[PDB]
Amino acid sequence: KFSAKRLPSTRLGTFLENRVNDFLRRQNHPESGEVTVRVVHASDKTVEVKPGMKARFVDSGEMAESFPYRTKALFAFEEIDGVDLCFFGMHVQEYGSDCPPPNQRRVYISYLDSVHFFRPKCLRTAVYHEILIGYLEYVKKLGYTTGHIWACPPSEGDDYIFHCHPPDQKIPKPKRLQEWFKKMLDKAVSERIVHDYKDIFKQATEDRLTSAKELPYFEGDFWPNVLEESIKELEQEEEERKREENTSDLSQKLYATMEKHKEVFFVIRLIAGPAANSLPPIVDPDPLIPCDLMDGRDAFLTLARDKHLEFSSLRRAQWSTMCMLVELHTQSQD
Numbered sequence: 277k278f279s280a281k282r283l284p285s286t287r288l289g290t291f292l293e294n295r296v297n298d299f300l301r302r303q304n305h306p307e308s309g310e311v312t313v314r315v316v317h318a319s320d321k322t323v324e325v326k327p328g329m330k331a332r333f334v335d336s337g338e339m340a341e342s343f344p345y346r347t348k349a350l351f352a353f354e355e356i357d358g359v360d361l362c363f364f365g366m367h368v369q370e371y372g373s374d375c376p377p378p379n380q381r382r383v384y385i386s387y388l389d390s391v392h393f394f395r396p397k398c399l400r401t402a403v404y405h406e407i408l409i410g411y412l413e414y415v416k417k418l419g420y421t422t423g424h425i426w427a428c429p430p431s432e433g434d435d436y437i438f439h440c441h442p443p444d445q446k447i448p449k450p451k452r453l454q455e456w457f458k459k460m461l462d463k464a465v466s467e468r469i470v471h472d473y474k475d476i477f478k479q480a481t482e483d484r485l486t487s488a489k490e491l492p493y494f495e496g497d498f499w500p501n502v503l504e505e506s507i508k509e510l511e512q513e514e515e516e517r518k519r520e521e522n523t524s525d526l527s528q529k530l531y532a533t534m535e536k537h538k539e540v541f542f543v544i545r546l547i548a549g550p551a552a553n554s555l556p557p558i559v560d561p562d563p564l565i566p567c568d569l570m571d572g573r574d575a576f577l578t579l580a581r582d583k584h585l586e587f588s589s590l591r592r593a594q595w596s597t598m599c600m601l602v603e604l605h606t607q608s609q610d
């Protein structure tokens with residue numbers, strides 16, 4: 277059988293699905309189906325500091341040339357009338373206790389995506405939030421201190437994870453998506469999972485950040501590109517000065533840009549103050565899960581394209597879910 281449930285379990289996946297199914301049982305809605313959450317990829321990776329920042333801080337011995345992290349891909353499924361439906365996916369970057377600052381004990385959501393067929397409709401958003409809150413709860417348990425979220429909605433005709441969304445599945449505007457994450461985080465705060473959360477500018481300001489080398493540096497995130505762009509801006513400005521003499525600040529730029537886009541970037545403190553400073557090493561009890569299909573989002577989108585796996589109607593998404601689960605089961609076995 278190539279079911280979602282028969283996908284190999286992990287502690288993380290089991291923690292999340294139990295949280296979700298406990299929630300659903302409390303709601304006692306006759307339309308809800310059993311939810312399955314599976315981690316389908318886990319591997320060690322490194323994020324490499326880009327040239328501009330490398331020249332300025334890395335070659336100086338001030339900053340690590342790269343940061344080690346574990347990427348995980350997980351999916352949530354709802355079984356309904358005996359049929360599997362993949363309705364939520366997320367990739368995360370987890371920087372461990374052995375990671376050098378400024379990244380140590382941080383988690384970053386690379387991206388998340390959904391297709392809006394969860395049944396019942398009235399519990400869909402609540403279920404998304406239970407998954408995200410459960411995730412924050414879990415990594416907090418392991419000893420990660422801080423979560424990071426870029427509230428970036430996809431551009432028109434862009435799919436983060438699932439190929440071909442339903443035409444009538446609306447894409448939230450920035451403000452709506454921002455409020456969505458705030459509602460999730462506020463619930464996590466009420467449950468004493470999250471200590472507090474701030475926009476990136478307020479956080480930087482309070483942490484007394486003085487140098488770009490202090491800003492957490494994640495794979496594919498907004499800020500590494502802002503810093504490269506900024507550093508080339510400084511390079512151009514130096515050029516014009518040289519022109520002025522006839523021989524033809526970074527922290528200021530970063531703070532300006534942070535303030536401009538602060539609403540879009542959440543810094544989430546799981547463990548604050550003291551307890552954060554005398555933590556044991558993080559030991560993740562789940563094994564690595566090699567799965568080339570799910571290392572980052574590109575491979576699955578390509579697979580979907582090639583085999584025509586759309587998630588554009590309930591029935592189409594269920595069929596694509598079968599094809600997805602078949603691919604995952606077969607790539608695993610041999």
Ligand SMILES: CC(=O)SCCNC(=O)CCNC(=O)[C@H](O)C(C)(C)COP(=O)(O)OP(=O)(O)OC[C@H]1O[C@@H](n2cnc3c(N)ncnc32)[C@H](O)[C@@H]1OP(=O)(O)O
Pocket residue numbers: 385386387388389390391392400401402404425426427428429430436446447448449452453456
């Ligand atoms: C993990 C990250 O860092 S990546 C950033 C987030 N990922 C994405 O934006 C990818 C694509 N978006 C999605 O998958 C989904 O929108 C999610 C998972 C983010 C949230 O899904 P939901 O819980 O259903 O909330 P969403 O804000 O999309 O929609 C809720 C309601 O607002 C409506 N809505 C959404 N966008 C709009 C819009 N632009 N205009 C008017 N209404 C809208 C929905 O139709 C829905 O209405 P309903 O509840 O009456 O049915």
